[PDB]
Amino acid sequence: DQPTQTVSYPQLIDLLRRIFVVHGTSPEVADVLAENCASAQRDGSHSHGIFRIPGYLSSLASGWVDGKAVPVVEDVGAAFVRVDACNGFAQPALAAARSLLIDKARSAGVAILAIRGSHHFAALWPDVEPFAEQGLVALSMVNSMTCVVPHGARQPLFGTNPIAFGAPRAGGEPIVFDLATSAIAHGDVQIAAREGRLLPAGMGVDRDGLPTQEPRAILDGGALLPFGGHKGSALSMMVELLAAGLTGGNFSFEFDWSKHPGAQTPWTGQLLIVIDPDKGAGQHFAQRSEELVRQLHGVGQERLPGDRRYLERARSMAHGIVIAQADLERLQELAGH
Amino acid sequence: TQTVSYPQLIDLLRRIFVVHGTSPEVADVLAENCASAQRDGSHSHGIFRIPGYLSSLASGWVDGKAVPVVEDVGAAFVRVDACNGFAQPALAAARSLLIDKARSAGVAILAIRGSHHFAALWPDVEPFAEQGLVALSMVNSMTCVVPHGARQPLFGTNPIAFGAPRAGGEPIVFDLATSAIAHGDVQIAAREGRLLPAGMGVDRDGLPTQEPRAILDGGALLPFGGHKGSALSMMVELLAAGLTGGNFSFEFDWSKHPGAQTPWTGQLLIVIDPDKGAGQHFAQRSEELVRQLHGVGQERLPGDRRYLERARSMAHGIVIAQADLERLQELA
Ligand SMILES: NC(=O)C1=CN([C@@H]2O[C@@H](COP(=O)(O)OP(=O)(O)OC[C@H]3O[C@@H](n4cnc5c(N)ncnc54)[C@H](OP(=O)(O)O)[C@@H]3O)[C@@H](O)[C@H]2O)C=CC1
Ligand SMILES: NC(=O)C1=CN([C@@H]2O[C@@H](COP(=O)(O)OP(=O)(O)OC[C@H]3O[C@@H](n4cnc5c(N)ncnc54)[C@H](OP(=O)(O)O)[C@@H]3O)[C@@H](O)[C@H]2O)C=CC1
């Protein structure tokens, strides 16, 4: 068995920041991605934690993604902001337009951020959480690379296309959910393939369209199924239309990295809608949401969306972030240690 | 089965509403909405709902003469107090202002509170897409859905609708309840003595059941897609009620109003100009997605079934059982 070790949250952030800088990103990009990736690891979002470092680096090395891209923030309407990520990562683009977006949301009541030409290789909750912490409601969508078969279709077309939502609550941490519209997140398949284990059944099919539990069968010519059936498929179509169609970014099937050995980041876009829930209101949203939480506990829902992550976050801050010795060593070597 | 034209059905339903106490304005809105559903083949939200509309109005549970109060509260934010009336009249009252804001600011929100919605949601978003705008709407209903992992129902069937324009056809539109099945369909299965597939609901003891009667007899429904659909349902409560100021699905009941059938909640609508400051045409992008979907084998796109039925209705009229027509005429 693999012996484990622990690293503090700030230590992990510094380690990842060094890795990104050494491998070609600007310091701003390194700061953003390091905190993001470390935060995912801290919260137990394993698929989008340090597991993504190799993919980040091979994508950078191949020239597929520009780690030093400077986002172009476009103020196109009283409540509309677009950002040309310029073939760089999505997070730095969001960070560049965040203050403007918030000003518009508070002033106009709601504001949209449409990121195009961006690479998103992480969880989505980190993108909406900060807005909720500031008393704002946020909804976001991002499309990936093709891997999901539309309901009733014979071949894959949609990406794993996640949707995230964040909202404030008067008595605690923001209510936040982040879910892939595919039965299981594509990242889950990669993890299973890595760990050499099988997946639960009814989540994907092989190259021949037959049911399978082998991650390799799904990754090699196969595909994932939309969650819940036709409804999840409709929501996945919505993500393509909103994260790409509306933003100007590529749909999940509109990019090819075959010419860039090592490329793994989807080159698409991201949509974010931020709302001041109390704009012109005669009540307080945060009070209403707290009541909903109370009623949820009342009917027996002990675990609300986000609770699991907050628990892992608490554990990580108390006992440190658990990491395989071999993985920590690899990260240290990549940082130059 | 007699055949009536779309405009004839509207006129007939409008008379029924006016005869039963609604204002002429509300009658026009509801008549067109209900007739439109019948026209598209959405029988669950067509004339089948008339009895429920009338029973709800009879007790005063819903105010058929309510006058929506539009509140312009932000460059991109509009609120409307439905004043215990139906949701559609409230939306119609603020629609022009909402569109002006969406086109100017780029996006705009309409938060309706104190409204009764007894219809499908696609009629609410489709018009915006017909005008080149993208629209997303959420409405919370009445307690009957058990949150994932919970022991008792709390959320309503809470539907979500989406509408977007496409360059080569009618709007791409989807409208879905976040519950595994719509309540109306549980009633139908009960009447037809049909069992439901596994996972739609539970009995009064919280045990899984396929018997629609067991679900209706103190039972409850389950969210679609397990924990994921449940999270979306929670979002609907928060957006259609928490944000609007209307009641959550569990903050009202029909105990004091015999015959009440409508939830008294709210509705959220987000309308976006997809091309605001864009160096492309959204309608061309969506059309390409449609082409690609056809390319991978998806023959049916959300809305296609209704558009096909709609064409038939406009070309051959709306076919209705003589029995139903007679009673509608009597109600009129
Ligand atoms: N291109 C990209 O960047 C992509 C990123 N992803 C990311 O990968 C992801 C993991 O997604 P997916 O696998 O769908 O996640 P899940 O299926 O775990 O979780 C969906 C979510 O469901 C809530 N939840 C899970 N189990 C329960 C339960 N039993 N009761 C109540 N709520 C519950 C979660 O809370 P909680 O977290 O606290 O457990 C969370 O909000 C996301 O973070 C997503 O953003 C996916 C596809 C593409
Ligand atoms: N309080 C209220 O007012 C409430 C209203 N409702 C309403 O009742 C409803 C019916 O909803 P629900 O039962 O969820 O509907 P379904 O489960 O039938 O349909 C969900 C939708 O799925 C699309 N769809 C269905 N089958 C396929 C397929 N094979 N391939 C591709 N797309 C497909 C539909 O297109 P399409 O339309 O063409 O069939 C539509 O957008 C809605 O209209 C809803 O608004 C529900 C709860 C509460």
Q: Which CATH number fits the domain that encloses residue A20?
A: 1.10.1530.10
Cα dihedral sign, B222-B228-B232-B238: positive
Burial A205-214 (b: 16+ CB within 10 A, else e): bbeeeeebeb
Of all ligands present, the nearest one to the C-alpha of B304 is: 2
State the closest ligand 2 atom to the C-alpha of B140, by its place in the atom list counted from 1: 1
| Residues flagged as binding site of B for NADP(+) | 117-121, 175-177, 227-228, 300-306
* Domain-ending residue, one of B200, B226, B252: B226
Reduced to 3 states, what is the DSSP secondary structure of residue A13? helix
| A231 shares contact with chain B (CB less than 8 Å) | yes
Give yes or no: residues B106 and B163 share one domain. yes
Give yes or no: residues A56 and A161 share one domain. no
For residue B322, give how far its alpha carbon lies from the nearest alpha carbon of chain A (Å). 35
- Cα distances from A257 to residues A265, B45, B295, in angstroms, run 9, 47, 22
Cα dihedral sign, A15-A21-A24-A27: positive
Give yes or no: residues B7 and B134 share one domain. no
Give yes or no: residues A153 and A253 share one domain. yes
User: A326: domain range?
Assistant: 1-64+305-337
Residue of chain A whose alpha carbon sits nearest to that of B102:
A79
Give yes or no: residues B171 and B191 share one domain. no
Give yes or no: residues B222 and B85 share one domain. no
Residue B264: phi and psi, rounded to 5, are: -110, 90
Chain B CB contacts of A249 under 8 Å are none
Q: Which of B109, B237, B286 sits opposite A275 (nearest CB)?
A: B109
Closest residue by Cα to residue B266 from B112, B64, B42, B41: B112
Distance A322 CA to ligand 1 centre (A): 20
Q: Mark yes or no for CB contact B108/A110 under 8 Å.
A: yes
Report yes or no: B146 and B124 within 8 Å, Cβ to Cβ: no
Residue B317 tokens read as 């009229």
- Cα distances from B250 to residues A13, B113, B154, B254, in angstroms, run 44, 15, 6, 11
Determine if residue B205 is left, alpha or beta; phi over 0 gives left, psi from -120 to 50 gives alpha, anything else beta: alpha
Residue A98 tokens read as 């965040």
**In Å, what resolution does this model reach?**
1.8
* Domain-ending residue, one of B226, B261, B284: B226
Give yes or no: residues B22 and B77 share one domain. no
Per the structure, the count of domains in chain A is 3
Distance A309 CA to ligand 1 centre (A): 10
User: Using alpha carbons only, what angle is made at residue B113 by residues B109 and B117, rounded to the nearest 5 degrees?
Assistant: 100
Q: What letter represents residue A235's amino acid?
A: L
Residue of chain A whose alpha carbon sits nearest to that of B294:
A153
Residue A286 tokens read as 């945060």
Largest CA distance in chain B: 57
Give yes or no: residues B159 and B248 share one domain. yes
